[PDB]
């Protein structure tokens, strides 16, 4: 009715990868960066407490935490892998976070390997009847109150 509120916010998850012309002493073959960012004219820091990137167990300190922008991780590696990415919200009630499963891929679907790639994934979050305090952070971050 007139009494309910729905707020929608958008996130982008992305990465780039480049094949090194010289493998490292460990045989790492690629340089890659994974990032989480808001869209044009959006500052996700107002409603995001932190972004956690869960790296594969082979990496040093695999849980990478970003408490302020830019939310990103830079690493050198030899294989693609699935990376949980958790976005923790500045909300005292549920939901406290949202979890994505991101494919950190170093080569495209086509069988031949490539020299470099990048990828962007868009995600829309919807919040129904969020708390007075959380609602403001969502909107202050470039969020959209859904008009009936």
């Amino acid at each position: 009715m007139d009494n309910q509120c729905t707020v929608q916010v958008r996130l982008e998850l992305g990465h780039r990868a480049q094949l090194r012309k010289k493998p490292t002493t460990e045989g790492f073959t690629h340089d890659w960066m994974v990032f989480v960012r808001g869209p044009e004219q959006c500052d996700i820091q107002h409603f995001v407490e932190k972004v956690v990137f869960w790296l594969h167990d082979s990496f040093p300190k695999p849980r990478r935490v970003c408490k302020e922008p830019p939310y990103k991780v830079e690493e050198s590696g030899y294989a693609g892998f699935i990376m949980p990415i958790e976005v923790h919200f500045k909300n005292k009630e549920e939901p406290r976070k949202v979890c994505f499963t991101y494919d950190l891929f170093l080569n495209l679907e086509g069988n031949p390997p490539v020299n470099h790639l990048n990828h962007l994934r868009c995600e829309k979050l919807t919040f129904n009847n969020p708390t007075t305090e959380f609602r403001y952070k969502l909107l202050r971050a470039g969020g959209v109150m859904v008009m009936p």
């Binding site: 594969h56 082979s58 294989a79 693609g80 892998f81 170093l106 080569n107 390997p113």
Partner: peptide, 4 residues
């Protein structure tokens, strides 16, 4: 290529 190689996945882990």
């Amino acid at each position: 290529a190689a996945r882990k």
